[model samples]
Target: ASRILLNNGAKMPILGLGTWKSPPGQVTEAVKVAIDVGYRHIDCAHVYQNENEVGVAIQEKLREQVVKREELFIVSKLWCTYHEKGLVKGACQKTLSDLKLDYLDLYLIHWPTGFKPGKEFFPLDESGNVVPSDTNILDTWAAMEELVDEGLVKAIGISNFNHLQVEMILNKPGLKYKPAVNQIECHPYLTQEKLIQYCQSKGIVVTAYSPLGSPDRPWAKPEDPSLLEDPRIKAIAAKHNKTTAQVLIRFPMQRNLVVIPKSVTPERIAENFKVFDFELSSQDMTTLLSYNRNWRVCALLSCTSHKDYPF
Candidate 1:
C-alpha cells in the first residue's frame, strides 16, 4: 500500500477501510478480513461506537503477528459533544481504550460542529431543535493540540470542516500543530476542488470519505440517484475492465487524497482494495472530475438549522 505523509510528520495509508455504518456485530470480522486482505489503515470514530469490535480485530492481528503497531495506521475522531477542552483528552482516551491501542496514528474532530455532551444523535435538544452554540472550533482545536502534548494522540486533524474553519484554527495563536488532514465527503459527485486545493496548499492531506457515494448509507434517500450506476463511471469501468466502484476509488486516489470505502462483505472489501492495480487515463480522469455536481450525501443542513450550528 502507498502512504501519504501528514503535515505533522506521520505516515498514513493512501487508502483505508471506513467503519461508519459497520455495526458492532459485524465490525470485528470486517476489520480482520480487511487486514487479512492487505489493508494497513482503518478509519474509525466514537460516533460509530464500533471501536471495541475493531479493537478485537486489531488485537487478533497483533497476537498473530499479522502486522505491527507501526506497520498499520489507525484513525479515530472526536465526537461533536466533546468539543470542550476538559473533555477532549478523555474522548480520545475512550477510543484508545476501546481500540486497545497505545496511541492513535491520527485523531480528527468528527465535525466542525459542536453539541452539548450526553447527546448522541443530531438535534442536541429533545424537541428536535438545532442548538448551534457559541463554542469556537479553534477552542476545540487547542484542546486537540493538548492531546498531542499529553501523548494521547500522535497527530490531530478535523473532519467535515470547510476551508474557513481550517483557516480559523490555523490562524489561532499558540497553535503548535497544523491540521494533518481534513477528512470530508469526496467522490465523483462532489469533487471539492477548491477545498482540496486549499488544504493541500496549507500542507494538509485530504481524506475522501463516502468515496463510492455511500450507496448503502442508512440515511440515503430512496429517490436519490446512484453514482455507482452512473453511465459515465460505468463506461470508464468498461474501458478499464473494472467495476464502477473501482472507478470511484481510483478517481480520488489519482488526486492523491486518502480514500476510505466501507464494506462489511469480504468480497466487496477485497474488490475495493484492488484500486491500486490500474491507473486512469488523462481523459478519463478529466471526465470523472467533470462529474462533480456538488452532490453531498451527508448534508449538515440539519445541524445548520441549530441555533448553535457547528459549521
Candidate 2:
C-alpha cells in the first residue's frame, strides 16, 4: 500500500509488476495473478507485444470487480519508431486500444534515442546499426504534453533517459509538464546513486526497472554476474529470513524509488509482492549499495550510434 506522490499530484504505488519479457501467451495470467495478489500497478510497453493479452486480464479483473479502473495504475510506453512528433498520438492510441483503456495512469517514452519513424520498430541499416530519427527530444516532449492536454494519459514520464536528457526535458522552454518518473535499469549491480539523487532533487521520481537484475533477459550469458546468486546478498537474505529477490526489491523501495520486478510464475508473482513487511538495516542497505559494479544488463548497444543514446 506504499505510494509516492508524483510531481503532478498523482499517487503511484511504489511496487509494480514489470511485463517487459512476459510472453504474450503467459502475460495475461501473470497480470491476473498480480492483481489477485494485491498489486495495483502494472508496468507495460508497446514493444512488449503483449498489451493485448495484458488488456484481456485487466478487463477480466475489472469485469469481476476485482479492481476498478481508477483504483489501478496502468502504465505503457511509446516505442522508438513512434518518436516522431506527429506519430506520438497514434502510437499512444494504439497502446490504449490494445490495453482496452480509456487513459493510462502513466505513459513513458521508451528510450532517449528515436529510431527511424516507420512500421519497422528497429529499422537497422545494412551495417546493422539502428537508423536514427531527426526528431528532437524537445519536440517529442511537446507531443507527450499534448497527451496530457487531450486527457489520453493522466501523467507522462520517460524511460532509459540519463540525467542530462532529463535536464533537457526539465529545461525545455515553456515546458508544459515535468517528467514524473525516470525508469531505468537499476539494481545492486547498477545502483545509479548520482542519477537517482539528481532526479529526486528535481522532484522527479526514479523508477528502478529490473530490480532483481533481470535473470531471464534474452541476452544474458552463462558467465554474467548474477545478482540473485551473489553470496553476500544471500547472506543478507538469510539474516533477514527473506529470499534474495525480496531483499533486492526492498533496496530500491528504501531509496524512495519505485521498483518493478518481472515474474510470470504464480509463486514468484506472489513472493515479489511480499516485501512490504520488512525493512533492511542501514548496514545491509550500505552493503548492497557497495556491490555496485556499474553494470547494465539491458544496455541497448545497437543504439550506441544514435546521438541521443543514453548509457
Candidate 3:
C-alpha cells in the first residue's frame, strides 16, 4: 500500500476501497476482506447508506488485532443537505458514530451545491426534481474548517469540484485550510489532465473516483461505452500481463493521483491491490491519455439545474 503526504502532514494510502453503491447486505464482509488484504484506507460516506455495516467490519478488525486505530485512514463525506453552517457538525458526528470512530482521517464536502435539508437524501420536489438550498459553499467550508480545529477531522477536502470552484475556495478570504484533495471522476476516457495539473499546482492532491469508469452505476445506459471492454485498454493490459481493471486503476496512480476502485468480490478486491509490481511505460500512458473523450459516468443529472452544478 503506497501513501501520499497531505498538506496537513497526514499520510493517506494512495489506494483505497471505495464503498459507493456497495449494498449493506454485503459491505461488511467486503470491508473485512479488504482489511485482510492489507487495505488501510476505507473511502465511505453517509449518503452511501452503509456506514453501520462498514463500522461493524472496522470494529471486528480492531477487536481481532488486525489493525489499530492509528494505522487506518478513514474518510467520509458531508452530504449536500448538511451544507449549512449549523448542520455541518451534526452530519460529521453522525458519520463518526456510524463508522465508530472518534475522528475521521478526512471529511469532504460531497458537492458544491446544497440540497433541501431533511431526512431525505435527495429531497426531491413535488415535480420529481431535486430541491435546491441557498446555503453558501464558503459558509459550508468555514464549518468544515471548524471540524479540524475541534479535532473532529484530520483533513478536509472537496469532491466533484471543478477547477473554477476550487479557485473560489483557494482565493476565499480568511481561508484557514486549502482543500487537501479534489476527488473527481477520472479514467482513460476522462483524463482530467488540466484539472489534475491545476489542483496539484496549488498544493492540492487529487483523488480519482471511478477509475474503472463505474460500470456498475445504476443509471448507466445500455449503449454507454465500457472502459473495461475497450480494445486500447485491453491491448495495454495484455502488454503488461495485467487485467484491464488493474491498468485503469494504475493509470491515475502513475499520474500522482490517489485511485479508489470499488468492489465486494474477494478475488477482484485483491486483484485491484496488485498494482504496485508493474509500471506503465510512457508511450502506453500516452496511448491511454489519448483515449480521453471527457466522458463522465457519475454525471449528476438531477442537480444540473442547480446554480452550483459543476460539470
Candidate 4:
C-alpha cells in the first residue's frame, strides 16, 4: 500500500474504501472484508449515516487485534448543518461518538457551499424556510482548526471545494492548520490538472472520488456516457491486460493522488484495491490525461439557490 504524508505530518494510505451510498446492511461486512483484504484507510461522511456500521467493523477489528486504531486511517465529513460556529465542535463529537473512536485521521467540511442543517435535500423550501443561517466556509474552517488543537482529528480538509474557495480558507488569518487534503470528483473525464497542481503546490494531498466515473451509481441516468466503455481506455486496458476500472484507478495513483473507489461486493472491492500492481507508461499517462472533458456526475453544489453559487 502507498502512503501520502499530510501537511500535519500524518501518513495516510493513498488508496482507501469510500462508503458513499454503500447500503447500510452491507457496510459493516464491507469494512471488515476491505480490512481483511489489506485496506487500512476508510472514507466516510455524516450524510451517509452509515458510521454506526463502519464503527462496528472497526471495533471488531480492534477486539480481534487484526489492526490497531493507529494503523487505520478514518475520515469523516461535517455536513452543512454543523458548519455553524457553535455547532462545529458538537458535530465532530457526534461523528466520534457514532464511530466509537476518540479521533478521526482526517475531518473535512463536506462541501464548499452551505445549507440549513436539517433539510433532507438541496434547494431550500420556498416559503422562507428557516435555513440554519448561512455561515462562511472560513468560519467553519476555523472551527475545524480547533479540532486539531484538542486532538479531535489528526488533520482537517475541505471537500467539493474549488480553487477560489480553497484560497479563501487558505488565505484566512491565524490559520494554524493548512488543509491536509481536498477530496473531489476526479476521473479520466475530469482529470482536474490545474486544481491538483494548486493543491500539490500548497503541500496538500488530493483525494480522487468517482475514479471509475461512478458507472454503478444508482442515480446515474441510463443514457449517461460510461467511462468504463471509453474505447481509448478499453484499448489501454487491453494493452495492459487490466480492466478499465483498474486503469482508471491507476491513473490517479501514478499522479500521487489519493483515491477512494466504493464497492460493496467482495469481488469488486478486492479488484478495486488491486490497482497498485501495474504502472502506466508516460505515453499512456498522457493519452489518459487527454480524455478529460470536465465530466462530473455529482453536482450537489449546483442545486443550491445561493446567488453566488460556486460550482
Which stretches in model 1 have alpha-carbon errors above 4 Å? 306-311
Q: In candidate 3, what residue range of length 10 has the lowest lDDT sum?
A: 297-306
2 or 4, greater by lDDT:
2
User: For candidate 1, lDDT tens digit of each residue in 1-311?
Assistant: 49988877878899899998998999999999999999999999988979999999999999999999889899999987888778888888899999999899999988887776666645455656556546778888889888899888889999988877888888988888999999999988888999999999999999999988888787788787689998978999999999999989989988989999999999999999998889999899898999888888887545766443434
Estimate every model's Cα lDDT from 0 to 1: 0.88, 0.93, 0.93, 0.87
Q: Candidate 4: which pairs clash?
A: 81-117
Give me the overall lDDT of model 3.
0.93
Clashing residue pairs for model 2: none
What is the Cα root-mean-square deviation between model 2 and the actual structure? 0.8
Stretches of candidate 3 above 4 Å error? none
